[PDB]
Amino acid sequence: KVFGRCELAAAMKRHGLDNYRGYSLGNWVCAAKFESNFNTQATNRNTDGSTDYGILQINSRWWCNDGRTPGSRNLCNIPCSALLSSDITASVNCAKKIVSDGNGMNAWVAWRNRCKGTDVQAWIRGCRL
Numbered sequence: 782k783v784f785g786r787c788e789l790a791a792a793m794k795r796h797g798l799d800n801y802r803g804y805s806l807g808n809w810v811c812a813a814k815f816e817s818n819f820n821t822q823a824t825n826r827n828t829d830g831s832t833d834y835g836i837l838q839i840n841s842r843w844w845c846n847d848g849r850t851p852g853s854r855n856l857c858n859i860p861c862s863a864l865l866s867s868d869i870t871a872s873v874n875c876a877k878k879i880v881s882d883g884n885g886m887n888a889w890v891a892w893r894n895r896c897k898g899t900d901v902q903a904w905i906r907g908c909r910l
């Protein structure tokens with residue numbers, strides 16, 4: 782599924798991401814835009830051999846099991862393929878763990894480089910939320 786921007790903002794809000802660990806909704810939307818282009822089916826291989834999965838590009842090195850990342854953990858107790866669903870529930874629950882892990886949203890490379898320090902509210906401007 783390729784989410785519309787406001788469509789995704791509403792889904793994330795519904796699952797309790799707006800202001801989770803202090804991160805306003807726009808941070809999550811901006812993250813998703815640059816990580817996945819709002820595509821639940823996005824996958825991208827990392828240099829280390831791990832892969833990032835789904836709307837928030839959750840990494841098989843630590844968070845999900847894809848069966849081909851040696852030495853990795855599966856801290857969300859989920860197959861990585863469950864992160865590609867049209868339903869974002871699994872990606873959201875997993876993201877809540879990630880963001881609680883010590884570095885906040887800096888865990889998302891693209892958030893730090895493209896969203897952090899920007900007017901992230903713009904990402905939810907015009908949405909009925």
Ligand SMILES: c1ccc(CCCc2ccccn2)nc1
Pocket residue numbers: 815816817825826827833838889890891
């Ligand atoms: C690996 C390559 C590309 C991507 C696309 C999204 C932006 C990004 C870049 C780097 C790390 C994490 N996110 N994801 C993983």
